[PDB]
Design a binder for this molecule. Structure first.
Ligand code: HEM
Ligand code: HEM
Ligand SMILES: [C-]#N
Ligand SMILES: [C-]#N
Lengths: 253, 253
């Protein structure tokens, strides 16, 4: 084999011989000189990972549903080469299991993407828990997707209650009945409305109590659908104080 | 082979004959009785990917460092299946490679993860550009990781100027020289929900001017290190209307 970025390997169930290709030994961090061995292989694997490999080899000898295990050999320094081993059985004319044959795949890119996603989700939960303004995310038909802690305290809905509801549950009439059409008309666009301007509206808690609020939308695209992130600033204290200011001034005459 | 979960295929450059695994037939969504053929393979690809596959076989036909391209096949309607095709060259006895041979991998999970990360990154840029409050993310040593649009407007640094700088560039003395010690003193504390307490500090613009500000922090853990997300609110206008309210409340008392 030449230029195959995949390694290959074969483990006879009868003679316990293991042979692998040249790219296979480089992936394991094994030299030229070192001969192929079932025990050299289990030595490149940190302890618990060995148990998973051998338990999987015995299970593939039994029921025989394939072999798929992934592991990190300490191949370089201490960050390692992630590898996914895949294999299936070879039988003889009698149909006894004889050879376990398959591949080693480099999966360092796949594990890097997997952990970049994990960090993103952990950061999203952190923003959702922590942002002082209510943050609401909706899809292109107004259905709430994400709902921050500040939004739960402001609107009286838990995020499990809110998610999957229309965002219109947060609104008094008439905006409540019209909000789907405000979104639909923007989705026709030609930019008559700008999403970024910001506006003061009235929202209402699950109470039925209403309150002034300012909010800001940002738009994003994903998977052929728009999504909108809203940040809500309660203005009850802001308008109690400016009211007291105007009153005091006009009274001092 | 048996429960390999991977298809194998061997195409000859010279005879254009193709043999695929039985497991590879299910991946292409067709072939219950119809024999393998190179024309039938390109028939399952969309006529944008089949152009890419032909360029890839030509590329490896003349000095190719392997063969590695991925594509979505329709499989069956509403059942598109992403797969990754990998292959290498193999020689006869002395001359140019007889047959180009390799594997078909099911990569539906890999591309769900890739798309989920892509959605997360798009959302973070949207949040960063839309959020009204200055959002700043630092690592365990106070190095700025992220810097939102409102942060650049408020502090006077671009994100490209800010990222990789210590967060203490945003503060005056004495806090500027002590902020690193605040972070390390906190990291050897282990009590949760002390970062959750807000505080009123003074910030410093790159301008050199100072302003009162409130901010709130959330911790997260990733990769062995903490990260902190600050939400900064300018209090300049809040403290001056609150001062002109209660000094116009003392015109009579
Ligand atoms: C809960 C209180 C809310 C109220 C009372 C409200 C009200 C409104 C109004 C009055 C308009 C259009 C005004 C006009 O064209 O005459 C509008 C548009 C829109 N709103 Fe809301 N809204 C609320 C929350 C939200 C949230 C939280 C989001 C997104 C996360 C959102 C997304 C949109 C979109 C996409 C549009 C169409 C484009 C635009 O004009 O900005 N709304 N909304
Ligand atoms: C912009 C100007 C800032 C100033 C003037 C400032 C000031 C301070 C002060 C005075 C303390 C310690 C209070 C005490 O010891 O009693 C502190 C602690 C801390 N700061 Fe900042 N800070 C600023 C921005 C930030 C930002 C944006 C973040 C994070 C993204 C941050 C992260 C921390 C952390 C993690 C601590 C320790 C946790 C705590 O006890 O509060 N700082 N900062
Ligand atoms: C919605 N504004
Ligand atoms: C920083 N507080």
């Amino acid at each position: 084999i030449e230029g195959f970025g995949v390694g290959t390997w074969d483990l006879d169930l009868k003679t316990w011989a293991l042979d692998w290709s040249d790219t296979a030994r480089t992936l394991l961090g094994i030299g030229q000189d070192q001969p192929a061995s079932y025990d050299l292989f289990l030595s490149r694997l940190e302890p618990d990972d060995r148990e998973r490999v051998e338990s999987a080899i015995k299970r593939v000898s039994e029921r025989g549903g394939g072999f798929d295990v992934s592991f990190r050999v300490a191949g370089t320094s201490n960050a390692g080469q992630w590898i996914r081993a895949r294999a299936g059985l070879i039988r003889d004319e009698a149909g006894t299991a004889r050879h376990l044959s398959g591949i080693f795949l480099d999966i360092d890119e796949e594990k890097q993407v997997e952990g970049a996603l994990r960090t993103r989700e952990t950061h999203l939960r952190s923003i959702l828990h922590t942002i002082p303004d209510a943050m609401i995310v909706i899809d292109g038909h107004g259905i709430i997707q994400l709902f921050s802690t500040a939004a739960e305290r402001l609107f009286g809905w838990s995020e499990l209650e809110a998610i999957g509801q229309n965002v219109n549950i947060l609104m008094p009439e008439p905006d409540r009945s019209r909000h789907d059409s405000y979104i639909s008309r923007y989705r026709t666009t030609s930019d008559p409305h700008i999403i970024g301007i910001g506006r003061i509206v009235t929202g209402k808690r699950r109470d039925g109590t209403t309150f002034p609020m300012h909010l800001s939308i940002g738009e994003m695209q994903s998977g052929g659908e728009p999504y909108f992130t809203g940040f809500v600033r309660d203005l009850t204290e802001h308008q109690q104080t400016q009211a007291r200011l105007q009153e005091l001034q006009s009274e001092l005459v």
